[PDB]
């Protein structure tokens, strides 16, 4: 007889990042039970200066390495870090950033924003899974 089974990935909440999608313009990636990054499609600019300091960010040594390792590997495959916060935006190059964003999830939008947030029970229908980050790694 045929039988089916579904896997719950929230037992990998440590030692592996998890990610799930909520709306066609929002994505969420989680590290631990307290911190995550928001991947948001918007028509509103958050920063104006065209300078993205990243070496000074790691040289600051007042940050969380796990939080921005994901954004570093996203960059490999402008910014504003004043005060210790995390805020990255990509404006529309567009093909690559949208392809990476779709690689997470497995138009006429102006900005894609990566920002720090606290964990909430965000994603509605898609259960969390670590496959996207394994693929983009």
């Amino acid at each position: 007889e045929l039988q089916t089974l579904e896997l719950n990935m929230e037992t990998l909440n440590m030692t592996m990042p998890l990610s799930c999608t909520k709306n066609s313009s929002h994505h969420y990636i989680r590290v631990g039970n307290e911190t995550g990054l928001e991947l948001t499609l918007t028509n509103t600019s958050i920063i104006n200066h065209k300078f993205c300091n990243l070496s000074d960010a790691h040289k600051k040594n007042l940050y969380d390495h796990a939080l921005m390792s994901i954004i570093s590997t996203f960059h490999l495959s402008s910014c504003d870090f004043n005060g210790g916060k995390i805020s990255v935006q990509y404006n529309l190059v567009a093909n690559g950033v949208l392809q990476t964003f779709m690689r997470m999830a497995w138009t006429s939008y102006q900005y894609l924003i990566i920002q720090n947030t606290t964990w909430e029970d965000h994603c509605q229908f898609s259960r969390p899974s670590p496959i996207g980050y394994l693929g983009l790694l």
Binding site: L2, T4, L5, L7, N8, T11, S129, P130
Partner: protein, 139 residues
């Protein structure tokens, strides 16, 4: 016989397989399921043998990825997705159980296409072939 708990299944409590079926996870490298077993085992070892993590370990998982999982199969599934063919989502798996006896089969993952899980009618050939495989395995 490797066994799965209620914390790593949805709607199920205890569901597990013979060790002889799990033995195929180090011989054939075209199976979508054994990667999840490797991830689960690595997670258990990491949470047991390493205590009080300093806010998550990123390099350790970064390097276990190169040593545990199959990157080619992941790229194959991605290419299928971007090209409108049924692919695998790494979240749903089907198998055969043979309820009269108990001998089971290694799960093959469900095929997802167009955001809908295609039913047993559109891949019944795989079911028949695997049933024939267990029929041969009966001898």
């Amino acid at each position: 016989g490797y066994c799965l708990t209620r914390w790593m299944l949805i709607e199920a409590e205890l569901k597990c397989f013979g060790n002889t079926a799990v033995a195929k996870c180090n011989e054939k490298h075209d199976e979508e399921f054994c990667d999840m077993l490797r991830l689960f085992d690595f997670n258990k070892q990491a949470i047991r043998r390493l205590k009080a993590p300093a806010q998550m370990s990123i390099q350790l998982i970064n390097k276990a990825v190169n040593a545990l999982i199959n990157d080619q199969l992941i790229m194959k599934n991605h290419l299928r997705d971007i090209m409108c063919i049924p692919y695998c989502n790494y979240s749903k798996y089907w198998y055969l159980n043979h309820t009269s006896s108990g001998r089971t089969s290694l799960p093959k993952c469900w095929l997802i296409s167009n955001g809908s899980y295609l039913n047993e009618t559109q891949f019944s050939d795989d079911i028949e072939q695997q049933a024939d495989n267990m029929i041969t395995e009966m001898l």
